[PDB]
């Protein structure tokens, strides 16, 4: 019975809330009371990557921490050697409406998606040396908002049809599907062991998914509006989310509840991108106010501001070695920061 | 290592010349987002201009390139992907004029949300009321009764500058200009001069349509130029 199911669901939600309240014996602010503040984090722009025409909608760092792919809605994926700022590849896209890009962990491939609802995989190491669509993954019924490689043959994607999908690139078929979000999945992040991944959606909630089984292990609530970005804390047992309610929030997977919140009265614009530093002590969040804040992840105090973008900061990335940050923006420039 | 640096710089230059050519092509074409409901006659407009998660129609008027995007196979929750179209020259809007107990109210709310959205507040809109023949048929038959779906029709009088079409009944003119004035009441409120609207009374099979957008797009370009000189 639908009414019986609704009553049972309400009782289960109340039980979950009571369990979370019981587990919250201490606050993170009280726990981190003995940790000295990090002070002011004065980062400066070291490289400015020019060449994109339209607003840059995504970027992703390479595992070498030197090359990085950037997608602009002029119909271009540009691969930068961020050290020398020389472009390595300039891949024209079949559809100019790209909303996400990914760089393969081995560096052999890049991926992109967008309003065409199709994930295109580009091989950077072809026999001729040019870049051609190695694989065209079709089957999503909504725009592709994020995609992340697991390896050279499997890629996890998040679409505007409220579902995520794990694709086998060799055959082109969907290996796995993840359903349960009621709003569009706006970002996903793979765990360090890539056995789980968290997806934040336009339902003001994040969900932890088991890639092997396809089930949603946990659902994290607490944000008030659309979640635009999400990323694991480096240990793999916590993560952070940025939302349209203009507040960042760090949750943990083992207490199944919010750990702590990064918000300020002067900030009314939502967060479009989040990313941790290598140790996780700093949470870097890009905002609609063209700035990017650096939060003390344990004290919630804002330790820095990455001002310098002329338009909305649409994408962030911290290198695997933690040397540099890179922020793309709607003004069509990537800036590297130290 | 200097050999690798030279090879990388040669690759960068070969990329940069192609980027120069692609920038020349990109700046020489105008991107039009075509937005409208299913029965709004939008597909008929696309068919006229011509004769997947998005459909791209390239056409050329007076040796000028236009790129019009009919966004199909998407969900009705547009608040996220619509942000992609903040850099288009114009959002062509197709409204089912003679049309959910109140469809035109939903169209008005969609136009209002587009107008007040912070990323689309700089992008201009071309407005097409694509049900003029059907509007004439409905209002002449006496089945309109618009004064209960929109009570403002009980006191609205035709503005003095609103020239009716030749041979056109006063009721048809009053209804069509009432719809136009509702869209203008939305648009003129908090417009702030950063973006503009071009209400056009269109039929589904008008050949003038490809011209209208032209004469709108051109105007938009000019205004943007006049915005750069602080003249507007």
């Amino acid at each position: 019975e639908l009414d019986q199911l609704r009553q049972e669901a309400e009782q289960l939600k109340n039980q979950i809330r009571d369990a979370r309240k019981a587990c919250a014996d201490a606050t993170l602010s009280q726990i981190t009371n003995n940790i000295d503040p990090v002070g002011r984090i004065q980062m400066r722009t070291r490289r400015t990557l020019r060449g994109h025409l339209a607003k840059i909608y995504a970027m992703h760092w390479g595992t070498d921490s030197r090359l990085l792919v950037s997608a602009s809605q002029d119909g271009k994926l540009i691969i930068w050697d961020s050290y020398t700022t020389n472009k390595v590849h300039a891949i024209p896209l079949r559809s100019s409406w790209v909303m996400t890009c990914a760089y393969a962990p081995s560096g052999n491939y890049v991926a992109c998606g967008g309003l065409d609802n199709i994930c295109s995989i580009y091989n950077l190491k072809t026999r001729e040396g040019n870049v051609r669509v190695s694989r065209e993954l079709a089957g999503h019924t909504g725009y592709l908002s994020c995609c992340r490689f697991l390896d050279d043959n499997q890629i996890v994607t998040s679409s505007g049809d409220t579902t995520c999908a794990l694709w086998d690139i060799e055959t082109g078929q969907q290996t796995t599907t993840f359903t349960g979000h009621t709003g569009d999945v706006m970002s996903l992040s793979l765990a360090p062991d890539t056995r789980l991944f968290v997806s934040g959606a336009c339902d003001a909630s994040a969900k932890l998914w088991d890639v092997r089984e396809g089930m949603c292990r946990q659902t994290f609530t607490g944000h008030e509006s659309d979640i635009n970005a999400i990323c694991f804390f480096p240990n793999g047992n916590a993560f952070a989310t940025g939302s349209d309610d203009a507040t960042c929030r760090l949750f943990d997977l083992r207490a199944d509840q919010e750990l702590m919140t990064y918000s300020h009265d002067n900030i009314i614009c939502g967060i479009t991108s989040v990313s941790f530093s290598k140790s996780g002590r700093l949470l870097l969040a890009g905002y609609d106010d063209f700035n990017c804040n650096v939060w003390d992840a344990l004290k919630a105090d804002r330790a820095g501001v990455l001002a310098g973008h002329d338009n909305r900061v649409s994408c962030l990335g911290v290198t695997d070695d933690g040397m540099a940050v890179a922020t793309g923006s709607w003004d069509s420039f990537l800036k590297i920061w130290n | 290592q200097r050999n690798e640096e030279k090879a990388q710089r040669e690759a960068n230059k070969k990329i940069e010349k192609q980027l120069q050519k692609d920038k020349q092509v990109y700046r020489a074409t105008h991107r039009l987002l075509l937005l409208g409901a299913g029965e709004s006659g939008k597909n008929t407009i696309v068919k006229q201009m011509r004769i997947s998660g998005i459909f791209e129609t390239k056409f050329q008027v007076d040796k000028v390139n236009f790129h019009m995007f009919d966004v199909g196979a998407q969900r009705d929750e547009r608040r996220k992907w619509i942000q992609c179209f903040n850099d288009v020259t114009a959002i062509i809007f197709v409204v089912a004029s003679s049309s959910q107990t109140n469809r035109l109210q939903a169209a008005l709310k969609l136009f209002d949300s587009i107008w007040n959205n912070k990323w689309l507040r700089d992008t201009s809109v071309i407005l097409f009321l694509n049900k003029q023949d059907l509007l004439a048929e409905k209002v002449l038959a006496g089945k309109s009764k618009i004064e209960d779906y929109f009570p403002e029709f009980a006191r609205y009088t035709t503005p003095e500058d609103a020239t009716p079409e030749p041979g056109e009944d006063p009721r048809v003119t009053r209804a069509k200009y009432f719809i136009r004035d509702e869209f203008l009441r939305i648009s003129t409120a908090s417009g702030d001069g950063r973006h503009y609207c071009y209400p056009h009374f269109t039929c589904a099979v008008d050949t003038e349509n490809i011209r209208r957008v032209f004469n709108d797009c051109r105007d938009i370009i000019q205004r943007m130029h006049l915005r750069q000189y602080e003249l507007l």
């Epitope: 009621t182 709003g183 003001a204 008030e224 509006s225 939502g270 | 608040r79």
Partner: nanobody, 126 residues
Framework: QVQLQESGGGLVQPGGSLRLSCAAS????????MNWVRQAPGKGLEWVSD????????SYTGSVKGRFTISRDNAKNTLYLQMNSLKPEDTAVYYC?????????????????????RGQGTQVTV
């Protein structure tokens, strides 16, 4: 979790008055705009009314002007629709909807079939 629980909908004689109430939880009520939408039997979602953050700016759909009145109570985090001069065509499921972002003027998607921040709704039969 964003929760919008409505109450007060029920059978009423034509020409009657009925007070739909909406209790909101899981978000800051004063920061977001609010909207009442309705779904008639066999019809799609229809926008009825909205009220801004401060409560000063009020709008209604044409078919309900002068009859229904929206209000918000920020100290109690609730939304009201006072219906008067009810008609048989007013029979519908009424959903208390929310704008997708705070301090923001655009209220996009409040009438979507699978909208997220929308209440379960209460049925009003006239």
């Amino acid at each position: 979790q964003v929760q919008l629980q409505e109450s007060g909908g029920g059978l009423v004689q034509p020409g009657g008055s009925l007070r739909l109430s909406c209790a909101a939880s899981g978000f800051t009520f004063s920061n977001y705009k609010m909207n009442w939408v309705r779904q008639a039997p066999g019809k799609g979602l229809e926008w009825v009314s909205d009220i801004s953050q401060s409560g000063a700016s009020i709008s209604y759909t044409g078919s309900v002007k002068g009859r229904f009145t929206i209000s918000r109570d920020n100290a109690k985090n609730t939304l009201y629709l006072q219906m008067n001069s009810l008609k048989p065509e007013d029979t519908a499921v009424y959903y208390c909807a929310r704008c997708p972002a705070p301090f923001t003027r655009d209220c996009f998607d409040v009438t979507s079939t699978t909208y997220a921040y929308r209440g379960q709704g209460t049925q009003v039969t006239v």
